Amino acid sequence: TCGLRKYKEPQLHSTGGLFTDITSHPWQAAIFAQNRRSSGERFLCGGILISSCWVLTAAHCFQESYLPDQLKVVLGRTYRVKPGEEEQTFKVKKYIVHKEFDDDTYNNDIALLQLKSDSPQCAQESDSVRAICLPEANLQLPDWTECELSGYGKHKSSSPFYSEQLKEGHVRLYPSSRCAPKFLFNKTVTNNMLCAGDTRSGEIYPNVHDACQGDSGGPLVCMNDNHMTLLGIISWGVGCGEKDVPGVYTKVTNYLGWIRDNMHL
Numbered sequence: 576t577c578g579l580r581k582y583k584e585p586q587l588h589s590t591g592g593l594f595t596d597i598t599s600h601p602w603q604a605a606i607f608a609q610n611r612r613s614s615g616e617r618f619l620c621g622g623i624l625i626s627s628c629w630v631l632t633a634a635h636c637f638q639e640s641y642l643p644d645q646l647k648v649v650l651g652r653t654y655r656v657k658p659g660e661e662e663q664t665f666k667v668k669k670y671i672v673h674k675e676f677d678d679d680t681y682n683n684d685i686a687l688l689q690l691k692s693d694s695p696q697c698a699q700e701s702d703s704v705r706a707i708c709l710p711e712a713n714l715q716l717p718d719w720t721e722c723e724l725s726g727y728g729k730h731k732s733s734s735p736f737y738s739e740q741l742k743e744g745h746v747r748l749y750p751s752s753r754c755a756p757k758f759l760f761n762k763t764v765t766n767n768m769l770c771a772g773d774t775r776s777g778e779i780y781p782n783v784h785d786a787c788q789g790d791s792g793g794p795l796v797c798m799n800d801n802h803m804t805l806l807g808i809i810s811w812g813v814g815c816g817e818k819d820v821p822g823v824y825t826k827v828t829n830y831l832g833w834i835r836d837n838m839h840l
């Protein structure tokens with residue numbers, strides 16, 4: 576029953592963006608770290624629940640080499656920092672950062688998190704917690720297809736604050752011809768990357784829907800065969816919501832092999 580969700584209508588707001596209930600994105604996860612000693616818990620990234628005890632994310636979310644006990648993963652929370660009514664918190668048993676992750680070019684920006692629970696069933700499905708469907712390796716959706724993204728990250732590139740509530744963004748798959756350095760300010764684009772951005776330009780709002788800092792590891796889901804299918808993991812981008820500049824994402828179909836292995840099967 577992956578890819579299902581009781582979609583509720585997002586509240587639009589000031590920036591022209593959207594705020595939404597966790598029910599519309601049950602696969603979304605919030606990862607926190609605790610560098611030890613004491614003194615707070617910092618928001619690290621977002622994550623995607625692919626199965627009851629596994630979570631996908633961006634390799635670059637792990638700058639400071641953390642230890643499993645430090646990392647905490649909460650699911651089923653709408654507000655980044657308030658405790659959710661049906662939230663579910665777990666702890667990392669072990670996390671895997673893609674061996675060939677290039678900090679310089681964000682290539683292979685992908686990492687797994689094995690949860691830890693006293694039962695072979697960690698996350699318990701509910702209207703607020705539910706896995707996303709992994710695409711088959713043959714899945715290549717048509718250019719310009721409409722997808723979605725979610726996260727609790729920043730709203731504008733230059734903002735010291737992360738979002739206080741779950742964001743919902745609407746973007747479209749850019750064609751390959753438009754996903755090159757020439758468009759991404761001469762920045763490097765690889766075969767493991769995929770561009771997606773909001774094409775609704777001009778309108779009142781200066782910024783278009785897009786993921787920003789703090790969203791990394793979050794999903795880029797597109798409906799396929801009546802089920803939300805995971806298509807990319809929020810990796811990088813030059814700025815945030817700049818009109819006509821697509822966001823770069825990790826091409827999940829390139830990593831089904833890597834996942835299948837590092838994930839116990």
Ligand SMILES: *C[C@@](*)(O)[C@H](CCCNC(N)=[NH2+])NC(=O)CNC(=O)[C@@H](N)CCC(=O)O
Binds near residue numbers: 787791811812
């Ligand atoms: C780590 C992760 O949360 C962020 C997500 C930003 C997503 N951006 C877009 N447009 N969807 N990932 C990174 O920050 C990876 N590094 C970068 O994106 C740098 N290019 C940041 C430079 C800048 O802020 O302009």
